[PDB]
Write a protein that binds this ligand. Structure first.
Ligand code: MGP
Lengths: 191, 78
């Protein structure tokens, strides 16, 4: 009955749902003209299947091809990847900064981060904390983060998310993943 | 602009009802059943291990829309 994409990648009739819809966003670098530094965040696409995810991923630039000051964000549908969104305003992030060196397969790390997000292995079913994940391309470094809805609903639920991100990123024990609130207030937790 | 066979199939396919163990052909692993064993709402929350998800990487390579390239260029056109 069920032909998956693995039975016939041109004629299949079942697809793999995600536990919510997700939207990919991209931040472009400021234009070299100089007339657009305040409108750089772009909504790319919303999707709801594992197959759709891979159609997107296979047709967009890997992180390692992005210009400096660019970002990708993968957020649950309805949440904009900004601190002002009502679902991020009282939240924060777990983050790690990587050096820009070739033995760091940043594309693979980012990919695995997004797969952990959409495959629901960052948090447990009732945690209600993960809002999205983000990769930032900067001059000195790359940063990978997991944005969270609160900073205090449950500390244990947040620490477990940080430990999972550290596992997903394959970091050794000296390398610490750090939690910070988005606002100075919601900041005033490392693993 | 014309959709691909895979895209046409994706558009018309039906969502699986959750994690299923017994629908994959030889050499393809199912999602880890242990991760879903503890899940309470199995019709809404679907845990897929990264290894399972990676199996799709070289399998579904088609664009998610016919003009995806044009939509992307105009979105980040500058
Ligand atoms: C996620 N985000 C990023 N920016 C802008 O993007 C820049 C990079 O944001 P960043 O948080 O990655 O900072 P970076 O580590 O590069 O360090 P900093 O710039 O020196 O503090 C910030 O400086 C802001 O100018 C943002 N601006 C707004 N208004 N809301 C956001 O949520 C937001």
């Amino acid at each position: 009955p069920h032909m998956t994409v693995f039975h016939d990648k041109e004629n299949f009739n079942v697809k793999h749902p995600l536990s919510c819809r997700w939207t990919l966003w991209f931040t472009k670098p400021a234009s070299g003209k100089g007339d657009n530094w305040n409108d750089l965040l772009k909504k790319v696409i919303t999707f709801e299947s594992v197959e759709e995810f891979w159609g997107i991923y296979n047709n967009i630039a890997p992180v390692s091809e992005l210009a400096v000051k660019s970002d990708y964000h993968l957020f649950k549908e309805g949440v904009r990847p900004e601190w002002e969104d009502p679902q991020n305003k009282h939240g924060g992030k777990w983050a790690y900064q990587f050096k820009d060196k070739r033995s760091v397969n940043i594309d693979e790390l980012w990919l695995h981060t997004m797969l952990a997000a959409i495959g629901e292995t960052l948090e447990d079913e009732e945690d209600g904390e993960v809002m999205g994940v983000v990769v930032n391309v900067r001059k000195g470094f790359y940063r990978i983060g997991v944005w969270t809805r609160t900073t205090e609903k449950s500390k244990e639920i947040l620490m477990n998310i940080g430990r999972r991100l550290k596992e997903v990123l394959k970091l050794p024990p000296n390398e610490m993943v750090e939690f910070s609130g988005h606002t100075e207030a919601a900041q005033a937790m490392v693993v | 602009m014309q959709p691909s066979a895979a895209l046409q199939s994706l558009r018309s396919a039906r969502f699986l009802p959750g994690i299923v163990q017994d629908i994959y052909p030889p050499g393809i692993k199912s999602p880890n059943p242990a991760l879903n064993e503890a899940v309470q709402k199995k019709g809404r929350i679907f845990k897929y291990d990264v290894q399972f998800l990676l199996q799709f990487q070289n399998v579904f390579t088609e664009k998610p829309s016919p003009d995806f390239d044009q939509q992307v260029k105009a979105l980040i056109g500058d």
